[PDB]
Amino acid sequence: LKLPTNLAYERSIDPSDVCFFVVWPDDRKTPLTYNSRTLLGQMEAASLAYDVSGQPIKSATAEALAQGNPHQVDFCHVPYGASHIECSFSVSFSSELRQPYKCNSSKVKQTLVQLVELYETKIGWTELATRYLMNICNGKWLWKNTRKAYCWNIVLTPWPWNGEKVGFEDIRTNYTSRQDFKNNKNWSAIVEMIKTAFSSTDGLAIFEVRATLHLPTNAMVRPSQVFTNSRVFQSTTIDGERSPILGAFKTGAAIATIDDWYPEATEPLRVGRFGVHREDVTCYRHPSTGKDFFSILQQAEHYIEVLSANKTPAQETINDMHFLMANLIKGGMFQHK
Amino acid sequence: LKLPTNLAYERSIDPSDVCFFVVWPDDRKTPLTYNSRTLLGQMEAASLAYDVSGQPIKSATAEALAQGNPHQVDFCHVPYGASHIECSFSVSFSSELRQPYKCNSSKVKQTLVQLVELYETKIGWTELATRYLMNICNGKWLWKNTRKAYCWNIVLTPWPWNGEKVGFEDIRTNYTSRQDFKNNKNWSAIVEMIKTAFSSTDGLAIFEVRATLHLPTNAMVRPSQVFTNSRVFQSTTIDGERSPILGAFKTGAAIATIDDWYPEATEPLRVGRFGVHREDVTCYRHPSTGKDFFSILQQAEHYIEVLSANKTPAQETINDMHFLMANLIKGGMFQHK
Amino acid sequence: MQTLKELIASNPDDLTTELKRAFRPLTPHIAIDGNELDALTILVNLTDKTDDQKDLLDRAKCKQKLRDEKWWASCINCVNYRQSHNPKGVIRTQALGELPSFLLSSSKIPPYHWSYSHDSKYVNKSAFLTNEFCWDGEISCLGELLKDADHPLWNTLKKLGCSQKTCKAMAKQLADITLTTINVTLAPNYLTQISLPDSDTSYISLSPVASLSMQSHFHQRLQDENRHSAITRFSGAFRMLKSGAKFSSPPHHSFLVLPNIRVCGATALSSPVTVGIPSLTAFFGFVHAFERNINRTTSSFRVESFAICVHQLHVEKRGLTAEFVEKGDGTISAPATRDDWQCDVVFSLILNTNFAQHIDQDTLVTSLPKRLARGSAKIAIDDFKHINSFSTLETAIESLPIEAGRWLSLYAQSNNNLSDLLAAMTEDHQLMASCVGYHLLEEPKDKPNSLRGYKHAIAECIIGLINSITFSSETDPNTIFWSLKNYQNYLVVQPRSI
């Protein structure tokens, strides 16, 4: 499978910004707000006192490193009397992965729209749908806010929905496993909705997620920062006042941190062409190893003829196929000019 | 038919920009706003780590694919408390396809002004009028905004109109086909108003179309881009503040996506001399087949004779007749210098 | 006024192909006064083979070519094409006539920066004769100078290499290049014809062309000015004026009132050197298309003036995707995007019609043109109730639905050069330049193919400054009300007053 000069996939999982609100003990919601404080840090960087090759600079004396430096930082935190902090967003699964959004050569278009349907038939969507929904249902879009917090509950309102709403209470303790999620009375009814949103040629499943997060007193909230103060919070305008938000793409990266199938697999990574780890920058699934998305896409006809057979596929092949379909769900330009 | 040195047609359908307003629960409209975020994306491209002929670039190490690249994109999204998004535009049908705007040979002018009349009387305007109108009455000018949306309603105000506003509620569920549109109490009076506007030599039918579109919370609105930032929204100024729009040509291309009468019909194409598909980059109705607009325009005399007969023409020739008249409605400079 | 910048100030620095930049238009002139004629025509000669074999200041490589009469002829045929105006034929003229002070066309700007414009096979061979430069203060090209056969340019080219016969052979051949020429046949519908009324009884079909001396003059002067510059890619990134900043809307406080015509994609690029509101001739084409539309039912409408009230004006650089049609031998594809500016101007009109009679809505909203300048001019359906014909002007301006707007009127102060036009636009913020009229280049004669068979006259855009006038009671309506006046040589849309 040679890569066509035009091959794009539109993303199937569209998340929205995570608007923040402070819920007061009288059950009134006022959007959070930050302010640019100014700090007096110390001369901390190694570049100040040390030269390259680790040689102390002769000008950086005990009086030079002594001088504190000012640093403007946006500071957001839960106000004092607040009951808790609510976090609202809406993530819509759709079936925009069936056929490529752009694909000039019909051979690679058909060998991919056939790849996805053979996937769905032999290896059901309940593996990618479950992992995508576990990040929704356990606070993962709440990136660092859930780290130091008493509790956080995920209320979840599906759109093409009929009965009650789906609540996950105290995910720190109750919902700490996949089975703990499957034990929910509505979990399978939601995984089936997602895998129908992925299967039907037009259907979609919009979820509206809402997290009640109980932080401690004056606890610092970490909303997304902006790209180039020392820390500028990414924010929208709620009720005419700026409220810090977790961006749409931060939330998308959160829901799509399911790529746990890769060499030396330790923790789930964000799905991507060359599986990058922001923790330790060097990316697994480097084009050197054959776990690169383009290397497992060049082998798409192989995967077709392999999981078209009657035999149950291997776990290595099915992991490569999982990563392939997840990277199609992410969408993007699979091309080379 | 020999094409003259110049043969242009003023376009019949005339659309306007699709402006977006945010309708709040207290029902005050405020034009949408789009702000240019900056994103730290990954190294997703195949051009970054793969050389021509599918061989990994050895300078693009794992450390190098780690570093995210900055991408300035314009984010436009339904504000938080927004009750819905109101998408308003206005399209005027007129009979500017009867006579050519310009021509040098009175032979081909006569054979087309007679062709439009023979078309109108033999195979009524009710087939192009209905297809032009269904794209207005089902949100199709809302290109991708209606994809992930709970519901969108099309209210519609024709100008040469005595009755009330004509509404199409819940187009996702109610109006899914042509017959579901015919069952509307006003549908006949509107398709006939269009087919009159095309008949009367100096009559027109102005529709002001307004789609209330219920995006989920913070859902991303998708207005038209501009050719390269990384995603520049094409915008206007409404109430003094800039608001993103779906351009006039984007909307005119939305209304004229009726052409499914091409070899191996799959789904409607935007009418043009060669049926060109921006989805699958290649172009149907290539001059190689006898379905390019110039090839069936050279056969305008044969179409005159096949319509002048008392016996109704074939379906395959009536489809080419339809496409010819629709391409004339689109207007354009049908010349070869 | 000349800070000459001789090559003695440019030879020592980085001569590698910064010479080609120096002698090409859109980059200011270079002085060869008496300084290095011999060495600075060597480079004019060696710019003939503009490809990778190019490393100039070589008397051997140049006298290689100056001895070739085949190259001589192939280059002297190029001077026949140094168009003074580019249709976007051979058209080099001086824009016959003379405008007033407040209007600006190429007739104000001195006539240089005339670049060869023909097939791209001799664009490099064009460099010898169709390159301009200043010397003796006279700014000329070797096509004009080497005609008289007795210039020091001739005898220094003799110093450089020749046959002592080409000095007169090529001289008499240069005498035959017809220094003023308009020869462009337009049956292939290549010259964007419009037709404008003239003398109230006939029409003249113009075919506007882009002034070369004025697209080079607005391009260099607009370098350091970046509020007033809007680079068009033209894939050759020309520059062009703009407004000072965004169009703000202060209040603007028979007569047929068009309440809120809203245009969607009108071409902001008024002139080839201007990006602002659409040309007033475009507004006048709109109102006279309106008049001609009504003339189908009431044959004595005859709008004699109109008053434009621009409520909103938004200039933006949208794409305007090219046409996918490529009737070639191979497959079809799409060319690049021209990168065309577009304005979305919501404006009102108050037509001073000589028709005090019921002109009821259904024939007013029909017979109302559906395009302002390639745009989609549309009056809202509920704004059809405000299309009313009043008797007095005061209540007509009172009756306009939206209040925040500006009335358009020329700016009567001098507009000789762009420097005079910018120094009037850095003081007046939203004073906006626009194509207002058409300076003819021909006496309008009947050409073989013409738009609607009228006489044809190749013209060029006349740029005038355009004000804002809040309509107070002590306001001259003759300033607000524009009208098309046809002087013999240029054809303008100027206010009734000015």
Q: Which residue has the tokens 């809307």?
A: C249
Give the CA distances from residue A36 to residues A39, A42, A72, B86, B225, in Å, rounded to whole numbers and listed in that order.
Answer: 10, 19, 6, 36, 34
Question: How far is Cα C390 from Cα C369, in angstroms, rounded to an integer?
Answer: 21
Chain A CA closest to residue B150: A159
What torsion do the CA atoms of C134, C138, C141, C142 make, to the nearest 10 degrees?
Answer: -100
CB pairs under 8 A between A and B: 141
Candidates B96, B283, B293: best to mutate against C (most CBs of C within 10 A) is: B283
Chain C CA closest to residue B274: C325
Distance from CA of C295 to the nearest CA of B (A): 13
A276–B37 CB contact, under 8 Å: no
B67–A281 CB contact, under 8 Å: yes
The answer to whether residue C295 neighbours chain B at the CB level (below 8 Å) is no
Question: How far is Cα C481 from Cα A119, in angstroms, rounded to an integer?
Answer: 71
CA distance from start to end of chain C: 32
Give the tokens for residue C130: 């169709």
Candidates B69, B74, B148: best to mutate against A (most CBs of A within 10 A) is: B148
Q: Which long-range contacts (CB under 8 A, 24 or more apart) does B198-201 make?
A: B198/B12, B198/B93, B198/B94, B198/B95, B198/B97, B198/B120, B198/B125, B198/B128, B198/B129, B198/B329, B199/B95, B199/B120, B199/B125, B200/B95, B201/B95, B201/B98
Question: How far is Cα A191 from Cα A186, in angstroms, rounded to an integer?
Answer: 9
Distance from CA of A284 to the nearest CA of B (A): 7
**Residues of chain B positioned with their CB less than 8 A from the CB of C189:** 5-6, 102, 335, 337
> Do B168 and B137 contact (CB within 8 A), yes or no?
yes
Q: Which long-range contacts (CB under 8 A, 24 or more apart) does B232-238 make?
A: B232/B74, B233/B34, B233/B74, B233/B76, B234/C316, B234/C318, B234/C319, B235/B34, B235/C316, B236/B17, B236/B19, B236/C314, B236/C316, B236/C344, B237/C246, B237/C312, B237/C314, B237/C344, B238/B19, B238/B21, B238/B31
Chain C CA closest to residue B204: C366
B218–A104 CB contact, under 8 Å: no
Q: Which chain B residues have any C-beta within 8 angstroms of a chain A C-beta?
A: 37-47, 49-50, 52, 54, 56-57, 60-63, 65-67, 70, 75, 77, 79-81, 147-148, 150, 216-220, 278-282
B65–A276 CB contact, under 8 Å: yes
> Do C267 and C384 contact (CB within 8 A), yes or no?
no
**Residues of chain B positioned with their CB less than 8 A from the CB of A96:** 147
Q: Which residues contact A313 (CB under 8 A, 6 or more apart)?
A: A122, A123, A306, A307, A321
Q: Which long-range contacts (CB under 8 A, 24 or more apart) does A170-179 make?
A: A171/A137, A171/A138, A171/A139, A171/A146, A172/A146, A175/A137, A175/A138, A176/A138, A178/A130, A178/A134
C339–B272 CB contact, under 8 Å: no
A102–B282 CB contact, under 8 Å: no
Phi and psi at residue C311, to the nearest 5°: -70, -55
Question: How far is Cα C153 from Cα C166, in angstroms, rounded to an integer?
Answer: 13
**Residues of chain B positioned with their CB less than 8 A from the CB of C344:** 17, 236-237
Give the tokens for residue A84: 């808790």
> Do C483 and C305 contact (CB within 8 A), yes or no?
yes
Distance from CA of A35 to the nearest CA of B (A): 20
Q: Which of residues 218-257 of C touch B (CB under 8 A)?
A: 246, 249
If residue B253 lies in a helix (H) or strand (E), which one and from where to where? helix B248-255
Structure solved via: cryo-EM
**What is the resolution of the experimental data for this entry, in Å?**
3.1
Distance from CA of C310 to the nearest CA of B (A): 13
If residue B31 lies in a helix (H) or strand (E), which one and from where to where? strand B29-31
> Do C146 and C174 contact (CB within 8 A), yes or no?
yes
What torsion do the CA atoms of C20, C24, C26, C27 make, to the nearest 10 degrees?
Answer: 50
